[PDB]
XYZ file of C-alpha atoms in Angstrom:
750
model
C 0.000 0.000 0.000
C 3.088 2.182 0.309
C 3.845 2.630 -3.372
C 6.972 1.898 -5.337
C 8.214 5.480 -5.213
C 8.644 5.224 -1.461
C 9.875 1.642 -1.481
C 12.739 1.918 -3.942
C 13.738 5.316 -2.583
C 14.119 3.820 0.896
C 15.678 0.522 -0.225
C 18.354 2.015 -2.466
C 19.994 3.567 0.610
C 20.836 0.907 3.192
C 23.733 -0.734 4.892
C 24.159 -4.260 3.445
C 24.233 -6.471 6.577
C 26.374 -7.474 9.534
C 28.155 -10.565 8.175
C 30.418 -12.437 10.468
C 32.571 -15.107 8.770
C 33.786 -13.237 5.725
C 35.085 -16.233 3.785
C 37.646 -14.959 1.324
C 38.244 -17.410 -1.508
C 40.684 -16.558 -4.292
C 41.319 -18.376 -7.561
C 45.033 -19.141 -7.770
C 46.909 -20.670 -10.695
C 45.681 -22.778 -13.566
C 42.540 -20.722 -14.085
C 44.397 -17.777 -15.618
C 45.993 -19.631 -18.531
C 43.238 -21.124 -20.738
C 41.240 -18.518 -22.683
C 38.720 -21.029 -24.031
C 38.312 -23.770 -21.489
C 34.613 -23.476 -20.442
C 35.007 -24.038 -16.738
C 32.103 -24.817 -14.527
C 32.173 -22.382 -11.656
C 29.835 -23.806 -9.046
C 31.592 -27.129 -8.548
C 35.044 -26.165 -9.773
C 35.373 -23.179 -7.438
C 32.372 -22.310 -5.316
C 30.909 -25.551 -4.024
C 33.422 -25.936 -1.199
C 31.861 -22.944 0.573
C 28.290 -23.217 -0.692
C 26.396 -26.132 0.808
C 23.202 -27.866 -0.190
C 20.387 -28.629 2.165
C 16.884 -29.821 2.957
C 14.246 -27.736 4.711
C 11.529 -29.332 6.797
C 8.830 -27.783 4.653
C 8.520 -27.503 0.821
C 12.114 -28.435 0.058
C 13.791 -29.569 -3.082
C 17.208 -27.964 -2.612
C 18.468 -25.316 -0.207
C 21.660 -23.338 -0.603
C 23.368 -20.933 1.748
C 26.966 -20.042 2.336
C 28.224 -21.744 5.478
C 26.380 -22.514 8.702
C 23.598 -19.980 8.297
C 22.793 -17.255 5.807
C 24.333 -14.477 7.916
C 27.770 -15.160 6.418
C 29.432 -13.396 3.507
C 31.830 -14.739 1.003
C 33.826 -13.247 -1.808
C 35.741 -14.492 -4.842
C 38.627 -12.314 -5.959
C 39.871 -13.633 -9.291
C 40.726 -10.497 -11.357
C 42.717 -12.584 -13.842
C 40.972 -15.926 -14.291
C 40.453 -16.039 -18.050
C 37.928 -18.485 -19.429
C 34.163 -18.756 -19.728
C 32.307 -19.630 -16.582
C 28.857 -21.081 -16.186
C 26.679 -21.430 -13.112
C 24.226 -24.099 -14.319
C 21.902 -25.135 -11.556
C 21.798 -23.030 -8.394
C 18.204 -23.345 -7.235
C 16.773 -21.825 -4.045
C 19.989 -20.036 -3.153
C 19.528 -18.195 0.128
C 23.189 -17.388 0.768
C 24.184 -13.781 1.189
C 26.656 -11.229 -0.032
C 28.495 -12.934 -2.863
C 30.575 -10.858 -5.179
C 32.048 -13.067 -7.826
C 34.646 -10.561 -8.964
C 35.539 -12.018 -12.381
C 37.661 -9.678 -14.416
C 38.437 -10.708 -18.024
C 35.901 -13.554 -17.952
C 32.823 -14.119 -20.078
C 29.983 -15.327 -17.893
C 27.019 -17.640 -18.384
C 24.210 -18.423 -15.967
C 22.683 -21.380 -17.702
C 23.150 -24.882 -19.001
C 20.602 -27.708 -18.411
C 19.184 -25.797 -15.403
C 18.459 -22.230 -14.378
C 19.091 -20.304 -11.202
C 17.538 -18.682 -8.145
C 18.577 -16.024 -5.630
C 16.422 -15.733 -2.528
C 16.752 -14.799 1.127
C 14.672 -15.534 4.202
C 12.340 -13.299 6.178
C 13.903 -13.975 9.561
C 14.227 -11.516 12.453
C 16.964 -9.685 10.508
C 14.983 -9.207 7.233
C 18.206 -9.253 5.296
C 19.101 -8.526 1.689
C 21.428 -10.647 -0.410
C 23.482 -8.032 -2.330
C 24.645 -10.617 -4.865
C 27.133 -8.837 -7.094
C 29.067 -9.999 -10.134
C 31.816 -8.279 -12.042
C 32.199 -10.297 -15.240
C 33.158 -9.166 -18.757
C 30.077 -10.107 -20.755
C 27.238 -11.789 -18.897
C 25.151 -13.850 -21.391
C 22.419 -15.030 -18.996
C 21.165 -17.682 -21.436
C 18.669 -19.454 -19.143
C 16.046 -18.459 -16.604
C 16.647 -16.894 -13.203
C 14.307 -16.582 -10.234
C 15.318 -13.674 -8.022
C 13.488 -13.740 -4.663
C 11.457 -16.796 -5.571
C 9.640 -19.250 -3.323
C 11.384 -22.261 -1.779
C 8.760 -24.795 -2.768
C 5.112 -23.964 -2.176
C 4.023 -22.138 0.960
C 5.756 -24.252 3.609
C 9.119 -23.697 5.245
C 9.628 -19.981 5.686
C 9.029 -16.584 4.131
C 11.452 -14.767 1.841
C 12.957 -11.334 2.429
C 14.439 -8.941 -0.125
C 17.433 -9.208 -2.448
C 19.651 -7.330 -4.893
C 21.204 -8.773 -8.028
C 23.795 -6.284 -9.189
C 25.460 -7.262 -12.482
C 28.234 -4.960 -13.542
C 29.894 -6.428 -16.622
C 31.953 -4.412 -19.056
C 31.036 -5.495 -22.597
C 27.264 -5.878 -22.931
C 24.696 -7.940 -21.100
C 22.900 -9.871 -23.787
C 20.540 -12.739 -23.146
C 18.647 -15.532 -24.828
C 15.175 -16.132 -26.203
C 14.421 -18.763 -23.542
C 15.858 -16.762 -20.625
C 12.887 -15.788 -18.472
C 14.029 -13.299 -15.857
C 11.427 -13.629 -13.125
C 11.955 -11.094 -10.353
C 9.293 -11.083 -7.695
C 7.765 -9.235 -4.721
C 11.018 -7.829 -3.350
C 13.697 -8.238 -5.982
C 15.546 -5.401 -7.664
C 18.562 -5.527 -9.961
C 21.084 -2.932 -11.093
C 23.091 -3.227 -14.336
C 26.028 -1.086 -15.365
C 27.545 -2.300 -18.654
C 26.852 -0.718 -22.031
C 24.101 -1.858 -24.427
C 21.963 -4.351 -22.566
C 19.746 -6.318 -24.915
C 17.456 -8.649 -22.989
C 16.023 -10.683 -25.815
C 13.806 -12.778 -23.545
C 10.953 -12.673 -21.058
C 11.464 -9.963 -18.482
C 8.808 -10.783 -15.908
C 8.589 -8.056 -13.257
C 6.305 -9.210 -10.479
C 4.705 -12.624 -10.134
C 2.519 -14.573 -7.749
C 5.305 -15.454 -5.323
C 2.765 -17.597 -3.487
C -0.049 -19.344 -5.308
C -2.916 -17.922 -3.250
C -1.532 -14.430 -2.651
C -3.535 -12.633 -5.320
C -3.339 -9.378 -3.334
C 0.389 -8.785 -2.889
C 1.844 -5.340 -3.689
C 4.849 -7.052 -5.322
C 7.205 -4.234 -6.196
C 10.425 -4.532 -8.173
C 13.015 -2.428 -9.993
C 15.392 -2.864 -12.891
C 17.551 0.140 -12.175
C 19.644 0.049 -15.324
C 21.231 3.112 -13.897
C 24.445 3.975 -15.718
C 24.099 1.854 -18.858
C 26.183 4.003 -21.179
C 25.049 2.481 -24.481
C 21.718 1.262 -25.825
C 19.142 -0.155 -23.427
C 16.972 -2.592 -25.342
C 14.292 -4.818 -24.012
C 12.286 -7.161 -26.104
C 9.543 -8.670 -24.001
C 8.431 -7.012 -20.792
C 5.671 -8.652 -18.809
C 4.727 -6.644 -15.726
C 2.370 -8.149 -13.230
C 0.556 -11.422 -12.742
C -2.804 -11.480 -10.886
C -1.862 -8.561 -8.637
C -1.184 -4.822 -8.647
C 2.530 -5.172 -9.311
C 3.844 -1.618 -9.161
C 7.172 -2.102 -10.868
C 9.550 0.630 -11.920
C 12.584 1.256 -14.099
C 15.116 4.014 -13.662
C 16.740 3.933 -17.053
C 19.531 5.960 -18.700
C 17.702 8.219 -21.219
C 17.369 5.857 -24.176
C 14.948 3.000 -23.668
C 13.828 1.200 -26.764
C 11.608 -1.622 -25.668
C 9.580 -4.126 -27.596
C 6.585 -6.079 -26.390
C 4.980 -4.789 -23.206
C 2.428 -7.135 -21.628
C 0.940 -5.408 -18.597
C -1.746 -6.601 -16.235
C -5.109 -4.980 -15.439
C -3.941 -3.249 -12.272
C -0.125 -3.450 -12.378
C 1.939 -0.282 -12.693
C 5.143 0.938 -14.295
C 7.358 3.931 -13.578
C 9.881 4.430 -16.354
C 11.877 7.326 -14.974
C 14.418 9.334 -16.906
C 17.553 10.865 -15.335
C 17.793 14.451 -14.165
C 19.323 16.940 -16.579
C 22.870 16.971 -15.253
C 22.829 13.229 -14.735
C 22.966 11.478 -11.409
C 25.423 13.036 -8.949
C 20.452 3.380 27.148
C 21.378 5.936 24.498
C 19.732 7.805 21.646
C 20.697 6.191 18.364
C 20.851 8.269 15.216
C 19.694 6.677 11.985
C 21.413 7.917 8.817
C 19.858 10.467 6.508
C 17.247 8.492 4.595
C 17.168 10.787 1.556
C 14.030 10.454 -0.580
C 13.231 12.171 -3.873
C 9.944 13.302 -5.313
C 8.633 12.968 -8.866
C 11.160 14.870 -10.931
C 11.695 15.818 -14.570
C 13.666 14.033 -17.244
C 16.604 15.439 -19.092
C 16.348 16.721 -22.630
C 17.163 13.743 -24.868
C 15.273 11.224 -22.758
C 13.796 8.786 -25.236
C 11.267 6.054 -24.426
C 10.278 4.239 -27.593
C 7.755 1.759 -26.264
C 6.774 0.386 -29.627
C 4.154 -2.154 -28.564
C 1.806 -2.140 -25.579
C -0.447 -5.052 -24.804
C -2.680 -5.527 -21.772
C -4.029 -8.928 -20.813
C -7.209 -8.886 -18.754
C -8.800 -11.967 -17.218
C -10.227 -12.914 -13.847
C -13.288 -11.862 -11.871
C -15.452 -8.800 -12.504
C -15.179 -5.682 -10.351
C -17.481 -2.649 -10.194
C -15.068 -0.557 -12.284
C -11.885 -0.603 -14.315
C -8.355 -1.364 -13.147
C -6.235 1.300 -14.930
C -2.749 -0.024 -15.507
C -0.343 2.875 -15.784
C 3.063 3.864 -16.984
C 4.283 7.121 -15.495
C 7.000 8.188 -17.842
C 8.753 11.420 -17.063
C 11.092 11.378 -19.994
C 10.952 14.404 -22.266
C 9.539 12.178 -25.027
C 7.246 9.210 -25.270
C 7.231 7.808 -28.778
C 4.948 4.854 -29.338
C 5.525 3.084 -32.608
C 3.662 0.986 -35.061
C 2.091 -1.677 -32.863
C 0.563 1.287 -31.072
C -1.799 0.604 -28.193
C -3.650 -2.639 -27.591
C -6.040 -3.510 -24.767
C -8.174 -6.438 -23.707
C -11.628 -5.944 -22.255
C -13.557 -7.977 -19.694
C -17.249 -7.329 -18.848
C -16.203 -4.185 -17.015
C -14.416 -1.492 -18.998
C -10.673 -2.011 -18.848
C -8.514 1.062 -18.639
C -5.033 2.146 -19.709
C -3.256 5.154 -18.179
C -0.507 6.442 -20.466
C 0.872 9.347 -18.478
C 3.803 11.662 -19.099
C 4.823 14.064 -16.355
C 7.341 16.335 -18.055
C 7.424 15.321 -21.672
C 5.506 14.897 -24.910
C 3.579 11.991 -26.383
C 3.887 10.891 -30.008
C 1.713 7.867 -30.734
C 2.131 6.862 -34.368
C 0.251 3.613 -33.939
C -3.377 2.545 -34.155
C -5.440 2.249 -30.992
C -6.976 -1.184 -30.634
C -9.137 -2.858 -28.031
C -9.587 -6.644 -28.095
C -7.127 -6.331 -31.022
C -9.127 -4.721 -33.801
C -8.847 -1.216 -35.183
C -12.383 -0.023 -34.501
C -12.851 -1.921 -31.282
C -16.504 -2.341 -30.442
C -17.445 -2.983 -26.826
C -20.683 -3.517 -24.934
C -22.414 -0.924 -22.745
C -21.009 -2.148 -19.439
C -17.487 -2.641 -20.809
C -16.643 1.004 -21.443
C -12.944 0.699 -22.315
C -11.102 3.800 -21.144
C -8.036 5.065 -22.967
C -6.257 7.925 -21.302
C -3.361 10.232 -22.110
C -1.714 12.924 -20.007
C 0.886 14.752 -22.084
C 3.067 17.270 -20.284
C 1.166 17.393 -17.001
C 3.428 19.311 -14.675
C 4.815 21.581 -17.366
C 1.444 22.250 -19.108
C 3.086 22.923 -22.481
C 3.029 19.252 -23.457
C 1.527 18.055 -26.722
C -0.192 14.731 -27.381
C 0.497 14.299 -31.080
C -1.334 11.314 -32.541
C 0.212 11.238 -36.009
C -1.811 8.130 -36.940
C -5.495 7.706 -37.730
C -7.155 6.441 -34.582
C -10.409 4.506 -34.636
C -13.029 3.974 -31.941
C -15.728 1.335 -32.108
C -18.598 1.377 -29.628
C -18.321 2.138 -25.879
C -14.612 2.969 -25.890
C -13.418 6.161 -24.243
C -10.645 8.607 -25.088
C -9.514 11.406 -22.830
C -6.535 13.709 -23.320
C -5.217 16.305 -20.869
C -2.501 18.055 -22.825
C -1.509 21.516 -23.969
C -2.031 21.341 -27.745
C -3.283 17.833 -28.494
C -2.670 17.586 -32.214
C -4.269 14.801 -34.221
C -4.704 13.490 -37.753
C -7.876 11.398 -37.858
C -10.648 10.354 -35.481
C -13.212 7.623 -36.124
C -15.921 7.519 -33.456
C -18.972 7.731 -35.702
C -18.698 4.116 -36.786
C -19.911 2.771 -33.444
C -20.939 5.760 -31.364
C -21.350 5.837 -27.568
C -17.758 7.001 -27.268
C -16.797 9.445 -24.527
C -14.381 11.461 -26.667
C -13.255 13.690 -23.820
C -10.808 16.598 -24.122
C -11.443 18.105 -20.701
C -7.909 19.143 -19.866
C -6.824 20.674 -23.170
C -5.102 23.982 -22.534
C -5.632 25.638 -25.895
C -5.955 23.714 -29.162
C -7.026 20.358 -30.589
C -5.959 20.529 -34.229
C -7.916 17.549 -35.551
C -7.688 17.125 -39.313
C -10.666 14.780 -39.741
C -13.592 13.988 -37.448
C -16.266 11.264 -37.606
C -18.969 11.349 -34.901
C -22.418 9.746 -34.672
C -23.453 9.593 -30.986
C -20.463 11.146 -29.277
C -19.634 13.319 -26.249
C -17.071 15.630 -27.839
C -16.133 18.536 -25.568
C -13.259 20.694 -26.834
C -12.236 24.040 -25.369
C -10.702 25.526 -28.532
C -9.821 23.927 -31.853
C -9.791 24.113 -35.598
C -11.255 20.857 -36.911
C -10.993 21.710 -40.602
C -13.311 18.880 -41.710
C -16.447 17.569 -39.996
C -18.647 14.520 -40.540
C -22.108 14.596 -38.965
C -23.492 11.068 -38.960
C -26.732 9.610 -37.643
C -27.148 6.590 -35.370
C -29.928 4.617 -37.014
C -33.176 5.220 -35.145
C -31.999 6.226 -31.652
C -32.979 9.810 -30.894
C -31.436 12.024 -28.237
C -28.039 10.435 -28.941
C -25.888 12.509 -31.238
C -22.775 14.642 -31.416
C -23.242 16.662 -28.235
C -20.729 19.454 -27.693
C -20.822 20.025 -23.948
C -18.385 22.857 -23.145
C -17.083 26.197 -24.419
C -16.162 26.333 -28.088
C -14.752 29.797 -27.635
C -13.072 32.518 -29.639
C -10.367 31.140 -31.930
C -12.431 28.084 -32.889
C -13.031 27.089 -36.496
C -14.446 24.291 -38.649
C -13.417 24.647 -42.283
C -15.914 22.061 -43.571
C -19.124 20.745 -42.034
C -20.688 17.735 -43.744
C -24.067 16.496 -42.633
C -24.569 13.178 -44.392
C -28.064 12.500 -45.698
C -29.534 10.788 -42.676
C -32.185 8.211 -41.848
C -35.831 8.230 -42.841
C -38.362 10.692 -41.388
C -36.635 11.171 -38.001
C -33.742 13.205 -36.565
C -31.839 10.350 -34.959
C -28.314 11.765 -34.998
C -27.196 15.357 -35.136
C -25.137 18.152 -33.626
C -25.851 20.751 -31.014
C -23.583 23.122 -29.162
C -23.826 24.321 -25.578
C -21.382 27.209 -25.229
C -18.975 29.452 -27.118
C -19.144 32.878 -28.699
C -18.052 32.396 -32.333
C -17.218 29.653 -34.817
C -15.734 30.443 -38.227
C -17.425 27.801 -40.372
C -16.579 28.014 -44.054
C -18.455 25.177 -45.740
C -21.676 23.382 -44.849
C -23.925 20.638 -46.177
C -27.654 20.251 -45.627
C -29.099 16.783 -45.207
C -32.466 15.087 -44.791
C -33.095 14.244 -41.149
C -29.849 15.260 -39.525
C -30.008 18.529 -37.593
C -27.359 21.228 -37.241
C -28.524 22.783 -34.002
C -26.305 25.789 -33.256
C -27.117 26.592 -29.642
C -25.665 29.457 -27.629
C -22.995 30.673 -30.069
C -23.557 34.279 -31.037
C -21.141 34.978 -33.917
C -21.445 32.002 -36.285
C -19.426 33.428 -39.167
C -19.558 32.077 -42.732
C -16.988 33.065 -45.361
C -17.499 30.744 -48.346
C -20.022 28.297 -49.855
C -22.753 27.390 -47.354
C -24.213 24.593 -49.402
C -26.363 21.463 -49.389
C -25.267 17.886 -49.930
C -27.984 17.413 -52.573
C -28.611 20.709 -54.435
C -30.003 18.761 -57.396
C -32.663 17.202 -55.121
C -33.140 18.499 -51.587
C -35.677 16.581 -49.524
C -36.374 15.683 -45.934
C -35.704 18.249 -43.229
C -32.654 19.883 -41.645
C -33.225 21.684 -38.347
C -30.724 24.558 -38.429
C -32.107 25.941 -35.166
C -29.902 28.965 -34.649
C -29.424 31.728 -32.129
C -27.261 34.228 -34.106
C -24.962 34.219 -37.111
C -23.080 36.538 -39.441
C -22.194 36.058 -43.105
C -19.043 37.658 -44.464
C -18.090 38.104 -48.081
C -18.991 35.983 -51.128
C -20.448 33.134 -49.031
C -23.270 31.728 -51.134
C -26.148 29.863 -49.519
C -28.476 27.135 -50.787
C -31.786 27.517 -48.965
C -34.593 25.224 -50.094
C -38.071 24.619 -48.762
C -36.810 21.168 -47.718
C -34.101 22.278 -45.288
C -35.906 24.408 -42.725
C -33.234 26.921 -41.694
C -34.888 28.749 -38.812
C -32.990 31.768 -37.472
C -33.886 32.892 -33.952
C -31.414 35.765 -34.023
C -29.636 38.506 -35.920
C -28.727 37.287 -39.410
C -26.157 39.925 -40.348
C -25.230 39.637 -44.004
C -22.223 41.307 -45.597
C -21.371 41.100 -49.342
C -22.664 37.582 -49.921
C -24.927 36.212 -52.643
C -27.614 33.905 -51.256
C -29.168 31.773 -53.985
C -32.683 30.324 -54.197
C -34.219 27.294 -55.851
C -37.910 26.918 -56.557
C -38.867 23.221 -56.038
C -42.100 23.966 -57.863
C -42.168 27.694 -58.632
C -42.222 28.736 -54.965
C -39.787 31.180 -53.367
C -38.459 29.637 -50.152
C -38.997 32.442 -47.642
C -36.438 32.740 -44.836
C -37.645 33.491 -41.314
C -35.394 36.126 -39.739
C -36.221 35.992 -36.057
C -35.212 39.431 -34.797
C -33.380 41.632 -37.311
C -31.703 41.001 -40.665
C -29.440 44.027 -40.288
C -27.331 44.171 -43.421
C -24.532 46.561 -44.324
C -22.771 46.564 -47.680
C -20.345 48.536 -49.823
C -19.550 48.894 -53.525
C -20.217 45.176 -54.032
C -19.604 45.335 -57.737
C -18.728 42.687 -60.306
C -17.502 43.150 -63.861
C -19.910 40.538 -65.253
C -22.532 43.254 -65.761
C -20.660 46.438 -64.819
C -23.419 46.842 -62.245
C -23.120 45.552 -58.658
C -22.972 41.904 -57.629
C -26.324 40.088 -57.525
C -26.821 40.551 -53.812
C -29.611 38.019 -53.271
C -29.915 35.663 -56.222
C -33.164 34.063 -57.370
C -32.239 31.196 -59.660
C -34.507 28.667 -61.438
C -37.430 31.124 -61.338
C -38.608 30.569 -64.895
C -41.432 28.401 -63.553
C -42.099 31.254 -61.108
C -45.806 32.093 -60.988
C -46.489 35.331 -62.853
C -48.768 37.998 -61.299
C -47.984 36.891 -57.749
C -46.267 38.542 -54.818
C -43.455 36.163 -53.909
C -42.215 36.750 -50.367
C -38.449 36.561 -50.667
C -37.586 36.246 -46.968
C -39.322 37.333 -43.780
C -37.731 40.648 -42.894
C -38.272 42.446 -39.610
C -35.693 45.262 -39.556
C -33.578 45.963 -42.639
C -31.135 48.654 -41.611
C -29.064 49.161 -44.736
C -25.790 51.028 -44.772
C -22.781 51.678 -46.943
C -19.519 53.474 -46.168
C -21.334 56.720 -46.997
C -24.911 57.931 -47.313
C -24.304 57.979 -51.075
C -25.615 54.952 -52.908
C -24.896 53.384 -56.319
C -21.330 54.643 -56.242
C -21.300 58.028 -54.510
C -24.443 60.148 -54.288
C -26.873 61.574 -51.762
C -29.525 58.989 -52.646
C -31.138 57.107 -49.750
C -29.906 53.707 -48.688
C -32.771 51.350 -49.483
C -33.716 52.063 -53.117
C -30.873 50.164 -54.789
C -31.807 47.033 -52.861
C -34.429 46.825 -55.599
C -31.529 47.260 -58.026
C -28.687 45.024 -56.804
C -30.857 41.922 -56.361
C -31.440 39.431 -59.152
C -34.101 37.106 -60.472
C -31.284 35.192 -62.125
C -32.638 33.253 -65.113
C -31.864 32.451 -68.764
C -28.159 32.946 -67.888
C -28.948 36.588 -67.100
C -30.757 38.730 -64.543
C -34.471 39.103 -65.190
C -34.493 41.919 -62.620
C -32.273 44.206 -64.702
C -30.392 43.669 -67.945
C -27.176 45.653 -67.621
C -25.722 46.020 -71.104
C -22.281 47.326 -72.038
C -21.782 45.979 -75.589
C -23.644 44.442 -78.533
C -23.206 40.694 -77.996
C -25.182 40.435 -74.733
C -28.303 41.655 -76.571
C -28.977 38.028 -77.568
C -28.791 36.795 -73.968
C -30.886 39.788 -72.900
C -33.601 38.819 -75.372
C -33.355 35.276 -74.052
C -33.818 36.692 -70.545
C -36.874 38.775 -71.449
C -38.367 36.628 -74.227
C -38.620 39.272 -76.969
C -37.397 39.205 -80.574
C -36.580 42.932 -80.311
C -33.214 41.838 -78.865
C -32.801 38.484 -80.648
C -32.503 39.067 -84.384
C -31.237 42.665 -84.112
C -28.366 43.772 -81.839
C -28.488 47.381 -83.091
C -32.223 47.636 -82.337
C -31.674 49.547 -79.086
C -28.897 52.092 -78.562
C -29.620 53.176 -74.975
C -27.285 50.466 -73.696
C -23.625 51.266 -74.447
C -22.275 51.469 -70.921
C -25.776 51.691 -69.427
C -28.455 49.464 -67.908
C -32.202 49.048 -67.731
C -34.538 47.623 -65.100
C -37.259 45.192 -66.147
C -40.668 46.758 -65.655
C -43.227 44.313 -64.313
C -40.977 43.168 -61.449
C -41.089 45.051 -58.141
C -39.544 44.425 -54.714
C -39.800 45.804 -51.176
C -36.764 47.220 -49.401
C -38.319 48.974 -46.443
C -37.415 48.362 -42.829
C -40.175 45.746 -42.492
C -40.271 43.514 -45.590
C -38.248 41.898 -48.366
C -40.511 40.614 -51.142
C -40.735 40.054 -54.903
C -43.651 41.214 -57.085
C -43.231 39.121 -60.231
C -46.027 40.236 -62.535
C -44.248 40.778 -65.845
C -41.139 40.031 -67.873
C -42.059 43.051 -69.933
C -40.429 44.686 -72.929
C -38.522 47.877 -72.033
C -38.874 51.186 -73.783
C -35.821 52.556 -75.550
C -35.437 56.151 -74.316
C -38.401 56.599 -72.002
C -37.456 55.255 -68.587
C -36.572 52.270 -66.389
C -32.969 52.692 -67.588
C -29.836 53.447 -65.579
C -26.141 54.078 -66.171
C -23.206 52.096 -64.797
C -21.976 52.480 -61.203
C -18.442 52.606 -62.732
C -16.405 50.789 -60.094
C -15.031 48.061 -62.376
């Protein structure tokens, strides 16, 4: 219950023991003259002063030094050249070896493995088993702080297996290092490469499913390339292991447990370093920061999960205070029981760069049932708060799997939660930005504080209503979505959709309407549009699209596609700058737009060189089947406060502001404006006669000469531009007079 961070910090600073009987063996002559002999080293040197034994209680073998475990020995060779194997030291209790083998390749295995234990007597002693070989080459298994047999006999105290070779501590494929409840081990060569099963923490007893079972592989000063291959933390317990590495830790396969921990800790920046009785200064550190080039390339994470079912998750962790955390191509795996299993990928003072696909139960989407809500979790740069969680790979969520990220600027590339839905896609700790490139949501709990998701997919969820893409926090100032895409949803019901809950503005540039998916736009007061605000099916709109607003603004040139079949309902101040909203008829009817409070619109010299006159400010297309002799309400207007940069209209004048709103608009048909036919040359006379339906402009271009750099308004078409109504009075596509009236000049701003 203490935690590993206390335990290793208080066990790395002790006195070894009080050994009486310091046996001092020394290899003499004969050993130091055969470079290739392959000595044994237990029987050929050691076994005089290491005795076997039988314990009354769970014995097979029993080794100590001499007459009780409270005795040291040493072996001072320093010249004995050869290659020395151990081969079969099982249940070694012993104490305080240091097989000081200079210029000697080691081996710890042939036909049998090894063990290094102590006993939990009244002294609670360590073992402090050192070696000082040249290579090591473990090459079979090893059971540091194991059990004697099963249960009987005695209990086991702690141990240390220091291993301080000088060429590189490799290993074998079949060499299962199994360090248990108390065992640590230092290493101090260069370029360890443990190519076998590293098994930190195990059931030391068969029934003890509730042991803390700490460990440590303090590869402290390994000056080369640390390299694991197969790390398997935990077995049926909360094994809180730890590693204090040396700022480059490639590992391979990680196989955690449900509730076992891991503390991969980088170095500091500068690198490491009666009577009253006074204990020595038990120095203890707190959670500190890595150095700069502290690399942890855990390139595959797995997580087995089997056993009983608890009320919640278990949340295996790996606190990793290096200044990086790269996770490669195997990415993140998980396995899920009936309760939602949980992975805690922390980083105190670094970054995270996961370039691998998230899986759960080993598939890319990863569906899960409603009770098994699998919980992925990332904490990038916690105690510096400028830490990024870059996921440079396309992630994918199935159903009932949960992401949360607490970073500074959690960049992304691709998010797939709309395939399954029911995915808590949390972002609750994001400091500023979440720069997602592609988003897929169906029934999702997205909550981002500030972002720019430059592409959006709005999916439905079949027939379930009330479950949708529910933004549940502040969207805020610098937010942006460069493309919204509502896919054409289900039949006759708004099952999926999007609503907001907070924020002040959202610069959306592109939109798509859709049957039976709703773009609810709650609580955001400056919904700005800058380019094409379109529909997914302009050739055939149908269904409904609840665009239940509260306020918006349209900037420049942003066209809109409002049908009768996508009920855009504004409950606020539609403020329209120089943008050309287009209509479609769907049966000769003008789709009126219901401005809730005030369609306050201000413009400027919004002129195009297509006519020489101004841009068609509100465009009425496809109105050739428009019903003649009928007032067509264009949009419901409540207050139209027009303005330009001056009082002067149609260029510069003293003319009032509202009259040219009859002029700049367009009933855009026959590839021309049926409102006015602004003519600057002789060739457009044919298209003008096609617009008005008169042979006076078809067969004769020189018929009318009032139109060289001029214009004329079509009589028989009137509009309202007061402060209370915008309408269209289409009663005639009439023939104009030549030099009598309804003719204007050019504004001359092109």
